[PDB]
A paper describes a structure:
Hydroxy-carboxylic acid receptors HCA1, HCA2, and HCA3 can be activated by important intermediates of energy metabolism. These compounds have been identified as the physiological ligands for a family of G-protein-coupled receptors designated as HCA receptors, which consist of three members: HCA1, HCA2, and HCA3.1,2,4,5 Upon activation, these receptors engage with Gi protein, leading to a reduction in cyclic AMP (cAMP) and adenylate cyclase activity. Herein, we unveil the cryo-electron microscopy structures of the 3,5-DHBA-HCA1-Gi signaling complex, the acifran- and MK6892-bound HCA2-Gi signaling complexes, and the acifran-HCA3-Gi signaling complex. Additionally, HCAs’ ligands, characterized by a hydroxyl group, engage with the conserved R3.36, Y7.43, and the backbone of S45.52 across all HCAs.
Additionally, to deepen our comprehension of the molecular mechanisms by which agonists modulate and activate the respective HCAs, we have determined the structures of MK6892-bound HCA2, acifran-bound HCA2, and acifran-bound HCA3, each in complex with the heterotrimeric Gi protein at resolutions of 2.80, 2.73, and 3.01 Å, respectively. As severe flushing would be caused in clinical trials by the β-arrestin signaling pathway of HCA2, synthetic agonists, such as MK6892, acipimox, and N2L, have been developed and MK6892 is also identified as a selective agonist of HCA2,25−27 while acifran demonstrates comparable affinity toward both HCA2 and HCA3. HCA2 and HCA3 differ by merely 16 amino acids, yet they recognize distinct ligands. Meanwhile, the acifran-HCA3-Gi complex yielded an rmsd value of 0.8 Å relative to the 3,5-DHBA-HCA1 complex. Meanwhile, the conformational rearrangement during the activation of HCA3 is also consistent with that of HCA2, involving the rotation of R1113.36, R2516.55, and F180ECL2, suggesting the conservation of the activation mechanism across the HCA family. In HCA2 and HCA3, R2185.68 interacts with D337 and D341 on the α5 helix of the Gαi protein, while R222ICL3 in HCA3 additionally formed a salt bridge with E318 in the Gαi protein. Previous research provide insights into several residues (L/V832.60, N/Y862.63, W/S91ECL1, M/V1033.28, L/F1073.32, and S/I17845.51) as key residues during the different specific ligand binding in HCA2/3.34,42,43 However, our chimeric HCA2/HCA3 constructs highlight N862.63 and W91ECL1 as key residues for HCA2 specificity (MK6892), and the first three transmembrane domains along with I17845.51 as critical for HCA3 specificity (3-HO).
Numbering used by the authors:
A (entry chain R): 11 to 301
B (entry chain A): 2 to 55, 181 to 354
C (entry chain C): 6 to 62
D (entry chain B): 1 to 340
The structure:
């Protein structure tokens, strides 16, 4: 039918229930286990708290929340439709996914910037920064994330397509809504920052020798590891979004039969953004000699 | 606060001002680099300090280079037991050790048979393998190479090291001495030893100290963040 | 030359530290026990003190 | 060298005679005499106060005679005076040399003293015309690091140093009135008698000596330990003193019997003792250890009557107030805790 005017078709596919739910459940279980164990270690098993641990704590919290709010979408796919829960726990879940993902990206970028300043500028005041200022920075970052995500809360996110109710935010429409702009923006700029910081770290550490200790050699690979993990986890979604925008521009919003395959591929690739939440403890939390 | 009297309020504000001063002093003192200077009587510590700076007890030298404030502590005057006060220096950025490599044939004034170089090696072995300096970097300075070049032509190194098997060229002898000193390091995993060959006119030792300190601080930062 | 002087000093020390009045161990132990039991009620750590007269509440 | 040999033989004969007399005077032992004594209940104290503000390791502390104020010394070059009742800081004296190793409080509450690797004993005036604190004197006669200092009056002080000597000073003059040169190793601690007519010291030669302040001579020499002596305390009665060493043992000596009386050791303990102190009645012997906690001993039965465990690093100093109300402990983790 229609979704707040702006004639644009939405699609429902039965292919999702065939493939996604098992893989998504496995990802949820792995992420929940990793996040819970990491939180258990950090909250009580450790006493020395620094700026790096503070900045990692918020990333762990965001990953834990994103893993927690996932069975709600498990229900959305196993039942295939109707969003039985209601209306408020649709805006709520579409808020708590976007906010969690944006927080994860922001805290990954902050960790990378902290490492870059620790390696390239060893004698800087930012390296010796009090826990109080770290808490202020964390609160400000969380506030920015919530302020950018709250746009979806003061609206209506229901469609009621015939006998099926869909709880969706990515609606294929000829519009330049803030959601699509944010989805495009929160990838390239953090990608550039991470690549620049990683390249500077590698170059400055390599020209300065320091290869005999071999723990420097152990740690010089994890930077590129996390860079490529971020790249592979967040490239396909933005690629598919760009292709969808190009198709929408070159074919309009009519003839709602070509969008089927690209929408299916988009929903396939949107599950990649949940893959990083289970690898994050592996390559960021248990990958350090500290514990 | 609400129930406190005037005298209690005065005491509380005095305590708060004292706390503010203590915190600012600690923050100011946490940005400096602390170095412990060691050696022997004629190792050449004073010669190094001559270009570094540009009642018995402990004498402290403060110098600035590239916007870093350094602080060297010379403890050569303390002739008491070393084990009773060596734990006060646990937590220094690095240890600077001075060795006169031109004294391979000279002998100690106190005891004739014992060589000076062997005594220096024993002192280095004691310091390097100390339990309070498990992961503290050591900067090794070999001082009198100008006299070493002249004395190695007319004398063989086999006097100090009877197991030496090589030519009496200056480069080979200096390399052999460097490997003899660096072989005493029994950790090789927690600490790094930096060796430099200097003279009375090298005038570039402060840059070497700065580079070693920068490497140590980078390693400390990486250990703190989680890597390394 | 001074070695004999230091040896004489040590001999002097041992000479006028070896001539003192030494009591039996039992008497000293009894005196210690008597002093400990005489001030037992005055020790605020041997016996718990009521919170009324405890300045460190 | 025949004269030297006969002198050595005479010294050996004198030592044998002294040992034989000591053995003869030992009719019984304290432990079997104290058999019919009710064991003290399990002592359990709690951390009533925690004083924070030091940013480096704490090496020494000393209680005031009013049982309310105390001074502590830290390697960040600070000398803080605390109010134990309200935790408030009264003074914060900066030091010229940050390598401080000891501190003391005047019995009248007017002066404090400190020293360390600089070989100087600096004396500060607490009550002045203004509200600040300024240096009043600097005693500079020692050739090794200064390890302990105690006040006799407002005009006398006794110091010990790493040059194997102890000295008595005059604050207004500034000269060593007397020198004590018996020891052959670094002196690490000293303790004055309540009447301030005698004092004992313990050195690195595993022996302790008793000195007369007025004369300047050693009276008795006590041995029995196996390693360094790190702390010494003097019995409240005035006829005994306790010694803590690096061999994980504490011992009690009697001045009048002139021999060791009783030893305090346990099989699990392998770390050295850093500080010892007595309770007001002398029944409890509190000792600080290297294994991060303090132990309370029964001075008559050698039974562990309690454990004070609240520190994350080595306990370097402890002291009991004059009225026996509380005991304070300092540690290398830069915190002071008051127990009761
Ligand atoms: C597919 C989707 C969804 C689907 C059903 C219920 C809630 C959320 O997952 C999010 C997301 O991860 O950003 C956006 C969505 O629209």
């Amino acid at each position: 039918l229609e979704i707040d005017k702006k004639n644009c078709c939405v699609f429902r596919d039965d292919f999702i229930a065939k493939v996604l739910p098992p893989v998504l459940g496995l990802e949820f279980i792995f992420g929940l286990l990793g996040n819970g164990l990491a939180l258990w270690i950090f909250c009580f098993h450790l006493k020395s708290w620094k700026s790096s641990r503070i900045f990692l704590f918020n990333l762990a919290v965001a990953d834990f929340l994103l893993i927690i709010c996932l069975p709600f979408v498990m229900d959305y796919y196993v039942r295939r439709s109707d969003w039985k829960f209601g209306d408020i726990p649709c805006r709520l879940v579409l808020f708590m996914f976007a906010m969690n993902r944006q927080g994860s990206i922001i805290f990954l970028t902050v960790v990378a910037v902290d490492r870059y300043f620790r390696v390239v500028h060893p004698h800087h005041a930012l390296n010796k920064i009090s826990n109080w200022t770290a808490a202020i920075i964390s609160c400000l970052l969380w506030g920015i994330t919530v302020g950018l995500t709250v746009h979806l809360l003061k609206k209506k996110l229901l469609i009621q397509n015939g006998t099926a109710n869909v709880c969706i935010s990515f609606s294929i429409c000829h519009t330049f809504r803030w959601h699509e702009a944010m989805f495009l923006l929160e990838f390239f700029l953090p990608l550039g920052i991470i690549l620049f910081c990683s390249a500077r770290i590698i170059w400055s550490l390599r020209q300065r020798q320091m290869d005999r200790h071999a723990k420097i050699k152990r740690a010089i690979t994890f930077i590129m590891v996390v860079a490529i993990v971020f790249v592979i986890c967040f490239l396909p979604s933005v690629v598919v979004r760009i292709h969808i925008f190009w198709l929408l521009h070159t074919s309009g919003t009519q003839n709602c039969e070509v969008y089927r395959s690209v929408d299916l591929a988009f929903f396939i690739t949107l599950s990649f953004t949940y893959m990083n939440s289970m690898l994050d403890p592996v390559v960021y939390y248990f990958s350090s000699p500290s514990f | 606060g609400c129930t406190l009297s005037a005298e209690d309020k005065a005491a509380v504000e005095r305590s708060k001002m004292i706390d503010r001063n203590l915190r600012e002093d600690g923050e100011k003192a946490a940005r400096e680099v602390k170095l412990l200077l060691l050696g022997a009587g004629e190792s050449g510590k004073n010669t190094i300090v001559k270009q570094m700076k540009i009642t018995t007890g402990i004498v402290e030298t403060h110098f600035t280079f590239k916007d870093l404030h350094f602080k060297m502590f010379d403890v050569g005057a303390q002739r008491s037991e070393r084990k009773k006060w060596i734990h006060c220096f646990e937590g220094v950025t690095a240890i600077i050790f001075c060795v006169a490599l031109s004294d391979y044939d000279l002998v100690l004034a106190e005891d004739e048979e014992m060589n000076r170089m062997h005594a220096s090696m024993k002192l280095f072995d004691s310091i390097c393998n100390n339990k309070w300096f498990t992961d503290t970097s050591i900067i090794l300075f070999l001082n009198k190479k100008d006299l070493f070049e002249e004395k190695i032509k007319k004398s063989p190194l086999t006097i100090c090291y009877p197991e030496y098997a090589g030519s009496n060229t200056y480069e080979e002898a200096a390399a052999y001495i460097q490997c003899q000193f660096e072989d005493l390091n029994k950790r090789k995993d927690t600490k790094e030893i930096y060796t430099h060959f200097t003279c009375s006119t090298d005038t570039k030792n402060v840059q070497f100290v700065f580079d070693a300190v920068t490497d140590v601080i980078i390693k400390n930062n990486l250990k703190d963040c989680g890597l390394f | 030359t001074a070695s004999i002087a230091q040896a004489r000093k040590l001999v002097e020390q041992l000479k006028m530290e070896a001539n003192i009045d030494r009591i039996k161990v039992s008497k000293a132990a009894a005196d210690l026990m008597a002093y400990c039991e005489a001030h037992a009620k005055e020790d605020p750590l041997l016996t718990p003190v009521p919170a009324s007269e405890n300045p460190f509440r | 060298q025949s004269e030297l040999d006969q002198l050595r033989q005479e010294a050996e004969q004198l030592k044998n005679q002294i040992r034989d007399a000591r053995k003869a005077c030992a009719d019984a032992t304290l432990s079997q005499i104290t058999n019919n004594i009710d064991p003290v209940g399990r002592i359990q104290m709690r951390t009533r106060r925690t004083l924070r503000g030091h940013l480096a390791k704490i090496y020494a502390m000393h209680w005031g005679t009013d049982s309310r104020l105390l001074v502590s010394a830290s390697q960040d070059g600070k000398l803080i005076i605390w109010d134990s009742y309200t935790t408030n800081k009264v003074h914060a004296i900066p030091l010229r040399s940050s390598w401080v190793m000891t501190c003391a409080y005047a019995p009248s509450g007017n002066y404090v003293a400190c020293g360390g690797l600089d070989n100087i004993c600096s004396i500060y005036n607490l009550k002045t015309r203004e509200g600040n604190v300024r240096v009043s004197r600097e005693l500079a006669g020692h050739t090794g690091y200064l390890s302990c200092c105690r006040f006799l009056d407002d005009n006398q002080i006794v110091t010990s140093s790493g040059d194997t000597t102890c000295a008595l000073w005059d604050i207004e003059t500034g000269q060593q009135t007397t020198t004590f040169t018996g020891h052959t190793g670094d002196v690490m601690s000293l303790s004055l008698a309540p009447d301030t007519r005698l004092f004992v010291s313990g050195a690195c030669d595993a022996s302790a000596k008793l000195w007369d302040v007025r004369e300047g001579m050693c009276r008795q020499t006590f041995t029995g330990h196996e390693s360094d002596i790190n702390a010494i305390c003097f019995f409240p009665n005035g006829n005994a003193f306790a010694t803590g060493s690096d061999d994980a043992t504490c011992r009690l000596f009697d001045l009048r019997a002139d021999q060791e009386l009783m030893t305090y050791s346990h099989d699990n303990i392998i770390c050295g003792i850093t500080s010892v102190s007595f309770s007001k009645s002398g029944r409890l012997l509190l000792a600080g250890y290297d294994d991060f906690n303090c132990n309370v001993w029964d001075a008559l039965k050698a039974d562990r009557a309690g454990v004070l465990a609240g520190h994350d690093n080595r306990v370097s100093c402890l002291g009991v107030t004059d009225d026996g109300m509380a005991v304070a402990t300092g540690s290398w983790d830069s915190f002071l805790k008051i127990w009761n």
